[PDB]
Amino acid sequence: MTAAEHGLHAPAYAWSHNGPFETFDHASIRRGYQVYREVCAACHSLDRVAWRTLVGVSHTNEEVRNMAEEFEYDDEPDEQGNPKKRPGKLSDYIPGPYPNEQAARAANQGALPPDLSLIVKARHGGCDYIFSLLTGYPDEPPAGVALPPGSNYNPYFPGGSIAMARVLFDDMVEYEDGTPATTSQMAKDVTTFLNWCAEPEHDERKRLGLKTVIILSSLYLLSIWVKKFKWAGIKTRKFVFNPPK
Amino acid sequence: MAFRKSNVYLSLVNSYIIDSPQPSSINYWWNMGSLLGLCLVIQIVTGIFMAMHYSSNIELAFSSVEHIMRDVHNGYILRYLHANGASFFFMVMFMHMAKGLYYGSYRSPRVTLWNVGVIIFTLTIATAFLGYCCVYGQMSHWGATVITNLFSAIPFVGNDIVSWLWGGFSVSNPTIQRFFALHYLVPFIIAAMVIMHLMALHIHGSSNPLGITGNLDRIPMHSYFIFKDLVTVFLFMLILALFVFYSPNTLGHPDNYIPGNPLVTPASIVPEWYLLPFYAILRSIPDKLLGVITMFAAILVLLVLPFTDRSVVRGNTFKVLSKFFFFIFVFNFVLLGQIGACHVEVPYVLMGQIATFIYFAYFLIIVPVISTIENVLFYIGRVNK
Amino acid sequence: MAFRKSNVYLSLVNSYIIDSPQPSSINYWWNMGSLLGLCLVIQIVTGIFMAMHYSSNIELAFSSVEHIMRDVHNGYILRYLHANGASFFFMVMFMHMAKGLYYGSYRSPRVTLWNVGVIIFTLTIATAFLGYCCVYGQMSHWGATVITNLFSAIPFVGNDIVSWLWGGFSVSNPTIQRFFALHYLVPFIIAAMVIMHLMALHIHGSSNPLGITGNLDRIPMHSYFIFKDLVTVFLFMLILALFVFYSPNTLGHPDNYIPGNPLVTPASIVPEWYLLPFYAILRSIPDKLLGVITMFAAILVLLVLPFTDRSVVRGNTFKVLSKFFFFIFVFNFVLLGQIGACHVEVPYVLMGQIATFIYFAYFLIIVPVISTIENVLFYIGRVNK
Amino acid sequence: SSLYKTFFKRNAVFVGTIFAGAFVFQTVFDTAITSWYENHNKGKLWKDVKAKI
Amino acid sequence: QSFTSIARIGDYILKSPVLSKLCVPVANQFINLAGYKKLGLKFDDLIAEENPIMQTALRRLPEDESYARAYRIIRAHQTELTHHLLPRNEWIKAQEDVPYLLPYILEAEAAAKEKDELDNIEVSK
Amino acid sequence: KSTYRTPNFDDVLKENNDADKGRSYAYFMVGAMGLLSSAGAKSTVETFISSMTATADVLAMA
Amino acid sequence: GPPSGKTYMGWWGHMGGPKQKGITSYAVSPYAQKPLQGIFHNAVFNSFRRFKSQFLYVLIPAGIYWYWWKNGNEYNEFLYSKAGREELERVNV
Numbered sequence A: 001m002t003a004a005e006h007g008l009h010a011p012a013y014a015w016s017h018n019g020p021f022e023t024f025d026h027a028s029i030r031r032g033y034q035v036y037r038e039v040c041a042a043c044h045s046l047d048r049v050a051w052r053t054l055v056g057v058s059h060t061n062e063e064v065r066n067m068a069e070e071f072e073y074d075d076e077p078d079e080q081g082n083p084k085k086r087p088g089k090l091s092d093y094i095p096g097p098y099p100n101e102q103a104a105r106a107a108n109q110g111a112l113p114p115d116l117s118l119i120v121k122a123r124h125g126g127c128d129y130i131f132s133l134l135t136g137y138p139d140e141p142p143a144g145v146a147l148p149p150g151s152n153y154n155p156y157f158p159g160g161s162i163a164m165a166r167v168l169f170d171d172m173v174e175y176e177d178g179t180p181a182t183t184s185q186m187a188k189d190v191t192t193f194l195n196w197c198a199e200p201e202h203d204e205r206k207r208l209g210l211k212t213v214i215i216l217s218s219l220y221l222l223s224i225w226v227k228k229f230k231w232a233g234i235k236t237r238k239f240v241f242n243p244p245k
Numbered sequence B, C: 001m002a003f004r005k006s007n008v009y010l011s012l013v014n015s016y017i018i019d020s021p022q023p024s025s026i027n028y029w030w031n032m033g034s035l036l037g038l039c040l041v042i043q044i045v046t047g048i049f050m051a052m053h054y055s056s057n058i059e060l061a062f063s064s065v066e067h068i069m070r071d072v073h074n075g076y077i078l079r080y081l082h083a084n085g086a087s088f089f090f091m092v093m094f095m096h097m098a099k100g101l102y103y104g105s106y107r108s109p110r111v112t113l114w115n116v117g118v119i120i121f122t123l124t125i126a127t128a129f130l131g132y133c134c135v136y137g138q139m140s141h142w143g144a145t146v147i148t149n150l151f152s153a154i155p156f157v158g159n160d161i162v163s164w165l166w167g168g169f170s171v172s173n174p175t176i177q178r179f180f181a182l183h184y185l186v187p188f189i190i191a192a193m194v195i196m197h198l199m200a201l202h203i204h205g206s207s208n209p210l211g212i213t214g215n216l217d218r219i220p221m222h223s224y225f226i227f228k229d230l231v232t233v234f235l236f237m238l239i240l241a242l243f244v245f246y247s248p249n250t251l252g253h254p255d256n257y258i259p260g261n262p263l264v265t266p267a268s269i270v271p272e273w274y275l276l277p278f279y280a281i282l283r284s285i286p287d288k289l290l291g292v293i294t295m296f297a298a299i300l301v302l303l304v305l306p307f308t309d310r311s312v313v314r315g316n317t318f319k320v321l322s323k324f325f326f327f328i329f330v331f332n333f334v335l336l337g338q339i340g341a342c343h344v345e346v347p348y349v350l351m352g353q354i355a356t357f358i359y360f361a362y363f364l365i366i367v368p369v370i371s372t373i374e375n376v377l378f379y380i381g382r383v384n385k
Numbered sequence D: 001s002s003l004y005k006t007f008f009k010r011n012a013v014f015v016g017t018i019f020a021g022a023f024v025f026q027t028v029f030d031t032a033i034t035s036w037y038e039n040h041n042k043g044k045l046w047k048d049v050k051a052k053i
Numbered sequence E: 001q002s003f004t005s006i007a008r009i010g011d012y013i014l015k016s017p018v019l020s021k022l023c024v025p026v027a028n029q030f031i032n033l034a035g036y037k038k039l040g041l042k043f044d045d046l047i048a049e050e051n052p053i054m055q056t057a058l059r060r061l062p063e064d065e066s067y068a069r070a071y072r073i074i075r076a077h078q079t080e081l082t083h084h085l086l087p088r089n090e091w092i093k094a095q096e097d098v099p100y101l102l103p104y105i106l107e108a109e110a111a112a113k114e115k116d117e118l119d120n121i122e123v124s125k
Numbered sequence F: 001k002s003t004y005r006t007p008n009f010d011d012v013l014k015e016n017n018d019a020d021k022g023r024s025y026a027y028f029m030v031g032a033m034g035l036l037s038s039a040g041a042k043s044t045v046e047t048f049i050s051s052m053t054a055t056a057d058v059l060a061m062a
Numbered sequence G: 001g002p003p004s005g006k007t008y009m010g011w012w013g014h015m016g017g018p019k020q021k022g023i024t025s026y027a028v029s030p031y032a033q034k035p036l037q038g039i040f041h042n043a044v045f046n047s048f049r050r051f052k053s054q055f056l057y058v059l060i061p062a063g064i065y066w067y068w069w070k071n072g073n074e075y076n077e078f079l080y081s082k083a084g085r086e087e088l089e090r091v092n093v
């Protein structure tokens, strides 16, 4: 299959979290939320992530309650059955930008921006692909590449033609912690955030993994030594034959 | 007489796990059986516990699993353990089957043991498919579609058998809700099939690497194999632990993280790894009916072995040509799976067909020819008349 | 040697359903056994088929059941069969238990047989209650509530066990979804429990109405009891059909056709007819804890029977005082179940208490006291030393 | 070894002694891992990012 | 496959000096490559015995050859379970690797063949 | 070869100066294996059991 | 319980093997043995002697197949490249 169709293979960047002993960089996760809220959130939903899940991971109980209350959600109708709204609460899920699919495609040349809750896991490459796709938008398609109106070229996406334009540009976000919001510094962040969104069990999982592998390893070694001991009698056993008269 | 011996219940145990006469020389390949037993338990248990959070509904399906993934405490461990357990179930099963071919476990008086085993193999592949559907991700829906459609190949009633399975005009809510029920049911049937497998094993005992009679030197299953099975049990767990905690989705397919969509089959659609060699075979025949018949044949041809094996001795330990061709068979199986993974492109198609040939040829031509040749080679190599 | 005998699988079938030596004199009460086997199948088959349409989700639960009644072809036949099959299961189970209780089948070497049977009773009641919750009707919800709360009686960990089961602050979605999950699982355990009941039966064979040994005159199971069993099978189906087709809801409770509601317990709440006697015993004790201890005790007390029956002969066929007191127990049991369907009002409360006393007093006082007297009575009535 | 003969005196470890020890382990072992793990990931954890705020 | 069959094909080869000079070497090498002699076993010890014919044979075997065979088999299992090979000097030297059970097998086979034939003999008037 | 002439086990027979060595090692191993297994069992059991306790999304404090 | 068909295995005391006579076995207690050694020094050069014998039945087949795959995989990579696009059109349909 022609490489243009397979897509350019995403390179292996050094993620602070790649490693059996490594946790996510919650500092980066936090900045990630911001890059999402100011740039990505205008076209992408995060339907599977409930507000409360940020508490104790990237922000504080107050900070989340505050981000949540800025949105209205449907509440139980009043005395006479009149539908009324309500400010968001921790038990809620991050609201999407479009009320339905038809409306999402209307605002996107006919295309549909996938919900980014499991994007890192729904693609080969994961962090490396998401990150590479974000940063690798060449200012101009290679020679001979005729592009469909309203489309954009990006070598990493399969077929090279992608409906999403480029959105990350230097200094477009003002990082709270004073970090230079360069177009790549951001990509690194949102990606990390999107990774936690898809794999929240992360840190907790690798920790249990360490307990498990240690214990089972010991049980394995111990078991070999025990087996040999029990089998010793049979292993060393000797036979002598004397043909009966 | 001892209680474990006289009691109605305990005695069944005593004669299967405690006093059961084993051949002193059975090696670690004979440990595959207990491992498959463990897989069944793990699968069954992790499954029942997830069922407590799952929703058969086509709308709630994928999300309920993601609910198990996020909201259920230790949920992810249950899912990653079920999911990776299935793949390990197949790895160990193939090994158990391989041990069978190599050591000629299929012949001798152990035929029925073999035949029941084949049934189990068919039942397991079914069970796993049904389960894979419950997630209802892209790979789920399309796999559900393609596989139920295998039956449209049946001459007349064919399309009826299909819309009957679906319970509608296409794979939909009825199909998923029913496939969940079926997925719950079959495992118990497998357990049942396992006891019969054990019953047949129990009348003639297990075999050994030499391929000759063990009756001259036995050692009780207990205080030997209970401890030896334990070595491989722990290892089995360790290696699974590694995937479940440090590499949970390596054995899976990414598309199964995008909900199913009836109007779009991903260009990257690819079967689960353990189904590939079979998928590869069907793909090699450029006709609908033949592709499906040839595929089922690829599974059923396993039944033909106790007859094509013309040898007068059991097992490959002392046969040269046998060992070699046996290994031509194993790798050819791997190459077959490797093929199912690639696209339907020029260098690969012809390769798939040749490999398919080899596969079937091993059972119907190679084994019967070589076994005959080796028989004579043995005779003329020491006979002076 | 014949095949039905020599084959590993048919020899089992053979020694259990074909060549099995039976006592020539066993009456029709011995037909209840196979009836229960049939019942287990009817429940299991009907259930799995209905499961393909059921949704355990609390918001969808009740409606999926109606979807079965209204949209699924023969869905109503499936539902009415399952529901009524559930009641018949108990009418028969009670008879099966009674026959044994009468003919002293719980005695001699058959204790383990009886003890296994008691477990199956506890398990069946459990399975049944799990399934009743799945409709999520008013009775469902409140049955779900009260019963799980039975455990809040346990002193320290109490409430914890309860909220653990619920999986929430109260009976909600988590409760109904894990309850379906478990309602599917237990039946298969019951099935296993049955094979043990059978293994325990098979070593001593059935008893007989005379209560003496049947070794002197045996007749094979096949072509006698296979056909005798057929008579009751049909008779059984005939009456179950009368209910399923002409009176499907007579054995039920109307409140269950109203969707469950957490804020209103209906003033018409009444347990399923087969649970009433036990419900009654619990109501008869004005203490929360003692109420549940006594109720559970009323079930466990059946294990005591092989030790309190001091008689030197087995069965009630030749005991005047025992036959009398047996029926006093039977009717008392019915009265108990009647008090249960009644209100907690003046004459009924005291009545319930007097009967509860009788119930327990039967196994603990009457039987031992009576049988001792009959032993002596049998002696002096013919000894002239 | 003479260390076994003082503690258990040539008798295998008792099933009650096993369970008792099993509990101790659970807590001891866990805290050890949790600590090593948190320390190794210092600066990345929420506890650490929460302080810089 | 029958030994009556194996012995048929084999002898024919062993007789015609053309096939003989060409095959016997391959056969000798095939056997030394098999490795059973290295476990103190003769080929006849390898013959799968779970059938009427072999069972008939083994019973008809003179007491001494039987006890000997018994030892050889046990020895094989002990060695195999220890994952070693017998000390080189204990290996069955090709001259000892005699088809001792074979005559009994063939006898039993042909005896069975006849019984089989006489059971279905047609009649011609 | 006479049956009273016991074969040579001097390749495996330990030269004793600490008679209870094989025993002390075995029993520690066995006991140690037992220790870790109860722990692993207790751990597996607790994992499943606790997977029934209230899910995150239902602990909505109203 | 009735009698079942004859098998090729009994149980302790009547396993159904040949009458054994003359074979004499000696064994020692695991307690009285060297606290598990044998590994290294005596059975390290002994280990891996297996799969040094068998490794050919395994290697030759592996080699034959891995070679065949690789080779065939490169031809794929070529056909779909710029260079081979002319040959690709030949052997495709």
Ligand code: HEC
Residues within 6 Å of the ligand: A035, A036, A039, A040, A041, A042, A043, A044, A108, A111, A112, A113, A114, A119, A123, A130, A133, A134, A157, A161, A162, A163, A164, A165, A167, A168, A190
């Ligand atoms: C609306 C104008 C968008 C903004 C702002 C961002 N995205 Fe987007 N995205 C949009 C479209 C039209 C699509 C469809 C692509 C297609 O042709 O299928 C997407 C897609 C993505 C994807 C999926 C890529 C794939 O493999 O299909 C990703 C990972 C993605 N978008 C990421 C992303 C991020 C992190 C953004 C904020 C910096 C972002 N998008 C903004 C439209 C729009």
Ligand code: HEC
Residues within 6 Å of the ligand: B040, B043, B044, B045, B046, B047, B048, B050, B051, B054, B065, B078, B079, B082, B083, B086, B089, B124, B127, B128, B129, B131, B132, B133, B134, B135, B183, B184, B186, B187, B190
């Ligand atoms: C209810 C009992 C239950 C049993 C018994 C059971 N499963 Fe499942 N299985 C489930 C549930 C629930 C799911 C859906 C959630 C999930 O994906 O884990 C599932 C999903 C699966 C999947 C999808 C894998 C994934 O998670 O992507 C496979 C494959 C599978 N089962 C295999 C098996 C096999 C093989 C067995 C063993 C016979 C088995 N299952 C037994 C309940 C069960």
Ligand code: HEC
Residues within 6 Å of the ligand: C039, C040, C043, C044, C046, C047, C048, C050, C051, C054, C065, C078, C079, C082, C083, C086, C089, C124, C127, C128, C129, C131, C132, C133, C134, C135, C183, C184, C187, C256
């Ligand atoms: C999944 C398989 C399945 C099995 C196995 C099963 N059931 Fe059910 N059962 C259901 C379903 C689905 C319902 C809900 C629909 C209904 O009410 O019939 C149900 C409902 C019930 C009800 C409620 C009665 C009513 O209102 O319909 C009872 C009682 C019951 N089952 C008893 C049993 C008993 C007793 C057994 C076993 C001996 C059993 N069930 C086995 C699936 C099963």
Ligand code: HEC
Residues within 6 Å of the ligand: B029, B030, B031, B032, B033, B034, B036, B037, B040, B093, B096, B097, B100, B103, B104, B105, B106, B110, B113, B114, B117, B118, B120, B121, B194, B197, B201, B205, B206, B207, B208
């Ligand atoms: C078609 C292949 C095949 C399948 C599939 C199979 N078995 Fe077996 N099994 C056999 C044969 C043949 C033997 C006898 C092997 C021997 O000892 O020579 C056997 C033996 C066993 C043994 C004894 C240990 C051993 O490995 O020899 C157990 C236990 C066992 N199988 C369990 C299972 C379980 C559990 C499953 C599946 C859930 C299973 N088997 C699937 C063919 C199969």
Ligand code: HEC
Residues within 6 Å of the ligand: C029, C030, C031, C032, C033, C034, C036, C037, C040, C093, C096, C097, C100, C103, C105, C106, C110, C113, C114, C116, C117, C118, C120, C121, C194, C197, C201, C205, C206, C207, C208
């Ligand atoms: C509380 C006790 C008890 C329960 C509940 C019970 N059994 Fe029994 N069962 C017995 C005893 C005791 C016997 C022996 C009676 C005799 O033959 O004298 C028996 C005998 C039988 C028999 C032989 C035929 C007969 O009726 O004597 C069968 C079959 C049987 N039971 C099936 C079952 C099945 C199936 C269930 C339920 C799913 C069940 N039993 C539940 C006590 C019980």
Ligand SMILES: C/C=C(C)/C=C/C=C/C(OC)[C@@H](C)[C@H](OC)[C@@H](C)CCc1oc2c(O)c(OC)cc(OC)c2c(=O)c1C
Residues within 6 Å of the ligand: B122, B123, B125, B126, B129, B139, B140, B142, B143, B144, B146, B147, B148, B165, B182, B269, B270, B271, B272, B275, B278, B279, B282, B295, B296
């Ligand atoms: C209620 C039960 C019902 C209706 C029927 C179930 C029984 C069917 C089987 O036998 C057990 C079946 C599993 C089969 O066996 C012949 C396997 C080898 C499957 C082979 C298989 O898999 C695929 C798969 O997984 C896919 O996913 C993405 C996609 C696929 O196309 C691209 C396939 C496919 O093309 C084939 C042949």
Ligand SMILES: C/C=C(C)/C=C/C=C/C(OC)[C@@H](C)[C@H](OC)[C@@H](C)CCc1oc2c(O)c(OC)cc(OC)c2c(=O)c1C
Residues within 6 Å of the ligand: C122, C123, C125, C126, C129, C130, C139, C140, C142, C143, C146, C147, C148, C165, C182, C269, C270, C271, C272, C275, C278, C279, C282, C295, C296
């Ligand atoms: C997963 C399994 C779990 C959590 C537990 C199940 C096990 C419990 C049982 O035994 C098996 C239980 C069925 C019990 O046994 C003592 C039965 C005799 C039932 C006794 C029973 O029923 C009622 C019932 O049905 C009702 O309907 C609306 C209402 C009820 O009062 C309002 C009752 C009731 O007051 C009692 C005591």
